[PDB]
Amino acid sequence: LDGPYQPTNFKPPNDYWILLNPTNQQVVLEGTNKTDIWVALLLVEPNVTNQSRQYTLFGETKQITVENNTNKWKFFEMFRSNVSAEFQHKRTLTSDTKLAGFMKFYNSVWTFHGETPHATTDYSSTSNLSEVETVIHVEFYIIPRSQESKCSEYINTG
Amino acid sequence: LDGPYQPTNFKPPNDYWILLNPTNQQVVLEGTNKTDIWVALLLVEPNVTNQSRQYTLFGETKQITVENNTNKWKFFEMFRSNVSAEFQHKRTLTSDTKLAGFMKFYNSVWTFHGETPHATTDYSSTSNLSEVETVIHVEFYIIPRSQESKCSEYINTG
Amino acid sequence: LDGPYQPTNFKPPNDYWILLNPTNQQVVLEGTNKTDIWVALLLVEPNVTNQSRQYTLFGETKQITVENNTNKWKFFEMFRSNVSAEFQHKRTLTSDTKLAGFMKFYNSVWTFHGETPHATTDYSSTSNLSEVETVIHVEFYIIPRSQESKCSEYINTGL
Amino acid sequence: LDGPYQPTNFKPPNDYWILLNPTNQQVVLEGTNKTDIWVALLLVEPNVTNQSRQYTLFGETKQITVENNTNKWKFFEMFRSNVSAEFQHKRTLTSDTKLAGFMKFYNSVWTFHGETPHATTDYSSTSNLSEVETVIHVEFYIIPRSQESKCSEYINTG
Ligand SMILES: CC(=O)N[C@H]1[C@H](O[C@H]2[C@@H](O)[C@@H](CO)O[C@@H](O[C@H]3[C@H](O)[C@@H](O)[C@H](O)O[C@@H]3CO)[C@@H]2O)O[C@H](CO)[C@@H](O)[C@@H]1O[C@@H]1O[C@H](CO)[C@H](O)[C@H](O)[C@H]1O[C@@H]1O[C@@H](C)[C@@H](O)[C@@H](O)[C@@H]1O
Numbered sequence: 001l002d003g004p005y006q007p008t009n010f011k012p013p014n015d016y017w018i019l020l021n022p023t024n025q026q027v028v029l030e031g032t033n034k035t036d037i038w039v040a041l042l043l044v045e046p047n048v049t050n051q052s053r054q055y056t057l058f059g060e061t062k063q064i065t066v067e068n069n070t071n072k073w074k075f076f077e078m079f080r081s082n083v084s085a086e087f088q089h090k091r092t093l094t095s096d097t098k099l100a101g102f103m104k105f106y107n108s109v110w111t112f113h114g115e116t117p118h119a120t121t122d123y124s125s126t127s128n129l130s131e132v133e134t135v136i137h138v139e140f141y142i143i144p145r146s147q148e149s150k151c152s153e154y155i156n157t158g
Numbered sequence: 159l160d161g162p163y164q165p166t167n168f169k170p171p172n173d174y175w176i177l178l179n180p181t182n183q184q185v186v187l188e189g190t191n192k193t194d195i196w197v198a199l200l201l202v203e204p205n206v207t208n209q210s211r212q213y214t215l216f217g218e219t220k221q222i223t224v225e226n227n228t229n230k231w232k233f234f235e236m237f238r239s240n241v242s243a244e245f246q247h248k249r250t251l252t253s254d255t256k257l258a259g260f261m262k263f264y265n266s267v268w269t270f271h272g273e274t275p276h277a278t279t280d281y282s283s284t285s286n287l288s289e290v291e292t293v294i295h296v297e298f299y300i301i302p303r304s305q306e307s308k309c310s311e312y313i314n315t316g
Numbered sequence: 317l318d319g320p321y322q323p324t325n326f327k328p329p330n331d332y333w334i335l336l337n338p339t340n341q342q343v344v345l346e347g348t349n350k351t352d353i354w355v356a357l358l359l360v361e362p363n364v365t366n367q368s369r370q371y372t373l374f375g376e377t378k379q380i381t382v383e384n385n386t387n388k389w390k391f392f393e394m395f396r397s398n399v400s401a402e403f404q405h406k407r408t409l410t411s412d413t414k415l416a417g418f419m420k421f422y423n424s425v426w427t428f429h430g431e432t433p434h435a436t437t438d439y440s441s442t443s444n445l446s447e448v449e450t451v452i453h454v455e456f457y458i459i460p461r462s463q464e465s466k467c468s469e470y471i472n473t474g475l
Numbered sequence: 476l477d478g479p480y481q482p483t484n485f486k487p488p489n490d491y492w493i494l495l496n497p498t499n500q501q502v503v504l505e506g507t508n509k510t511d512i513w514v515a516l517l518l519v520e521p522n523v524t525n526q527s528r529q530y531t532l533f534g535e536t537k538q539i540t541v542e543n544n545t546n547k548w549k550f551f552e553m554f555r556s557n558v559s560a561e562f563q564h565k566r567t568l569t570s571d572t573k574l575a576g577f578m579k580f581y582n583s584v585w586t587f588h589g590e591t592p593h594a595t596t597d598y599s600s601t602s603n604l605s606e607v608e609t610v611i612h613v614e615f616y617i618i619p620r621s622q623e624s625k626c627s628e629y630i631n632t633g
Contacts, residue, residue: 050239050283065246069280071330081208081223088223089247115462118276122227125208172546264422264439264544278462281422304436304590307465366556366599381563385597397525397540404540405564434593438544441525 001150003141011133012104015144017151020100022138027055028075029102029138031109033131034083037124039090039109041100042076044068062087075100077111079124093119097158102136104129105145117156121148161299169291173302175268175309176260180296185213186233187260187296189267191289195282197267198245199258200234202226220245233258235269237282251277255316262287263303275314279306317475319457327449328420333459333467334452336416337475341453343371344391345418347425349447353440355425356403357416358392360384378403391416393427395440409435413474420445421461433472437464478616486608487579487617492626493609494616495575502530503550503613504577508606509558512584512599516568516575517551519543537562550575552586554599568594572633579607580620592631596623 004021012018020041022028028041040057048068055062057078064087068074072094079090093100094115101121103110108123109132126132143151162179170176178199180186186199198215206226213220215236222245226232230252237248249271251258259279261268266281267290284290301309320337328334336344336357344357356373364384371378373394380403384390393407407429409416417437419426424439425448442448459467479496487493495516497503503516515532523543530537532553539562543549552566566588568575576596578585583598584607601607618626 067248067282086244090225091250114273114276115278118273120273124225125227264424276462307468310465383565383599401540406542408566430589430593431595436590 001141001143004139005141006139007137009133009135011130012102012142014104014129016103017110017143017145017148018102018134018136019141019143019151019154020102020136020138021140022098022100025137026053027057027137028100030058030135031102031132032058033126033128033133035126035128035131036081037109037126037128037132038080038083038087039111039124040078040087041102041111042066042078043098044074044076046071046073057087064089070094072096072115073098077113090124091122093155095119095155097155099155099158101151101155102134103145104132112152112155119152119155121152159299160301162297163300164297165295167291167293170260170262172262172287173304174261175301175303175306176292176294177299177301177309177312178258178260178294178296179298180256180258183295184211185215185295186258188216188293189260189290190216191284191286191291192241193284193286193289194239195267195284195286195290196236196238196241196245197260197269197282198236199260199269200224200236201256202232202234204229204231215245222247228252230254230273231256235271248282249280251313253277253313255313257313257316259309259313260292261303262290270310270313277310277313279310317457318459320455321452321458322455323453325449325451327446328418330420330445331461332419333461333464334418334450335457335459335467335470336418336452336454337456338414338416338454342369343373344416344452344454346374346451347418347448348374349442349444349449350399351444351447352397353425353442353448354396354399354403355418355427355440356394357418357427358382358394360390360392362387362389373403380405386410388412388432389414393429406440407438409471411435411471413471415471415474417467417471418450419461420448428468428471435468435471437468476616476618479614480611480616481614482612484608484610487577489579489604490620491578492618492620492623493577493611494618494626494629495577495611495613496615497573497575497613500612501528502532503575504609504611505533506577506584506607506609507533508601508603508608510601510603510606511556512601512603512607513555513558513562514577514584514586514599515553515562516577516586517541517553519549519551521546521548532562533558539564545569547571547591548573552588565599566597568630570594570630572630574630574633576626576630577609578620579604587627587630594627594631596627
């Protein structure tokens with residue numbers, strides 16, 4: 001656990017997790033290589049009735065549908081592979097820890113999804129992992145992949 | 159265990175789980191009241207690369223991007239509350255079992271989501287539950303909400 | 317399995333079961349938001365002939381007729397929706413496990429009723445769920461709604 | 476099945492089930508010996524919001540609170556053992572058959588309670604069983620106690 005770090009932008013190094021530690025930022029992280037991957041993590045608070053909210057993603061103003069019927073926080077992982085496409089709601093991380101993850105590894109972009117305390121890893125695929133750069137809007141930490149079991153413990157139990 | 163029943167277009171009774179038992183149908187279920195709820199369950203088999211597939215939802219042809227990196231099956235739950243809107247990927251049921259659920263209950267439509275064996279129920283809201291009808295493209299079973307534990311057990315372990 | 321917790325007076329979190337484990341307490345649980353829901357669980361031991369017993373519910377003394385013809389324990393679920401109304405005997409849980417359940421979920425209070433090992437949930441509606449507070453007179457456990465099928469298993473077949 | 480019989484006021488014989496077959500009556504049965512047994516079965520249709528309803532029981536105007544969250548019918552068993560006492564809601568039969576039972580046997584008045592198809596018998600005891608008389612508001616059948624397993628089948632499955 002290296003940190004905490006203040007909000008910044010950088011190409012996270014390969015084989016390390018970024019552990020994201022929002023307070024109430026709407027947009028937690030923007031990641032793109034400007035070719036074939038745009039990923040954004042949106043934070044929806046508990047007890048949100050189905051509505052359209054405005055988010056600024058990669059400088060573009062977007063209306064995205066959100067709902068949270070639970071007493072947990074939901075990270076909406078929004079994804080597109082074309083600069084011109086609309087975002088898809090690809091994954092959800094449902095959390096009473098309010099921690100999320102981002103990693104560049106094995107030509108993939110890895111996140112956590114599902115509901116704490118059983119949240120697990122999945123990925124999106126790229127031909128251009130080296131060019132993936134993240135704007136991180138929250139305090140964060142850096143955990144090596146050799147220590148993912150601790151990262152998964154912090155995501156699931158805090 | 160009540161069934162199996164053949165695929166049909168019908169109004170499911172309130173307070174019963176429809177336990178859906180597909181082989182490899184693309185579109186498992188289409189539910190709508192034609193006013194404020196459209197829900198479709200799409201079945202995505204293991205080891206699908208990011209790709210746009212065609213699905214006919216309520217007589218509308220849709221090009222929907224899907225991905226499954228896993229050796230499990232995924233039910234993509236597509237949702238909208240307006241006839242003129244595009245479908246959003248609301249939820250995912252990642253399944254060892256290839257079973258999914260649908261129930262009209264207590265003013266809401268209920269489905270399962272998450273990853274087996276930890277799939278859980280959540281709802282979508284409507285002011286018009288009584289007119290919600292389903293096209294079911296798969297063989298199904300009917301479980302009373304009273305036996306919701308048995309339905310969770312089938313969803314989670316087969 | 318989260319607990320045991322000691323008897324207490326607190327505001328149970330939404331979307332968790334409280335699993336109530338009495339010995340011989342008369343009043344197991346008293347839940348109210350002081351506006352539109354009062355729920356009390358009374359515990360009537362096996363082989364009780366028709367009789368009036370005294371209970372203190374929400375600091376008021378009540379005379380409630382009870383009976384239990386069985387070798388199982390009965391949780392009498394007493395209810396009202398008005399501070400000015402009398403309690404009615406709304407539900408019964410007939411139990412070999414001596415376990416009962418309470419949950420705040422989906423704008424409702426949820427309890428178990430019927431007879432082990434086939435007890436099922438039902439609900440009481442409220443305009444103000446989050447103000448429901450509970451005096452719990454017994455040892456208890458906490459089970460997330462995500463694990464309700466475990467809670468149902470415990471209710472029906474025991475700890 | 477001995478019947479059908481039309482609604483009537485009579486003294487049922489001991490060791491016979493009266494199988495009650497309501498349509499839409501508020502009050503199914505009023506039984507008393509005018510000494511230590513008063514029992515009324517009220518019928519409450521599906522999807523009834525907590526409300527105060529009016530019933531005439533043994534000539535008395537009563538306001539009783541009822542609720543039925545379910546899509547089954549509920550028989551509210553109302554009891555007292557003194558003519559000047561309030562009724563208590565002693566038992567419920569939650570039913571998709573709409574069949575209920577009444578029997579004078581041994582030292583007791585018997586009814587069904589619980590939820591179909593798991594409905595079971597229970598009793599109220601009396602020192603005056605032979606003077607128990609019933610106003611039956613509904614079509615009914617008579618079944619000997621020797622055939623109670625058929626009575627339980629009918630109550631539970633139709
Ligand atoms: C256990 C049993 O047989 N219960 C049935 C009940 O039997 C009553 C009679 O045996 C009666 C003597 O003739 O004794 C009653 O016991 C009490 C008195 O009521 C009480 O006043 C007194 O103070 O103490 C005595 C103790 O002797 C018994 O309760 O009769 C019921 C009325 O017909 C009948 O419904 C009940 O049958 C059982 O009920 C449950 C729920 O409905 C299940 O179906 C059981 O399977 C069922 O038992 C089965 O049927 C009966 C006829 C009998 O053959 C059982 O062996 C059989 O399993």
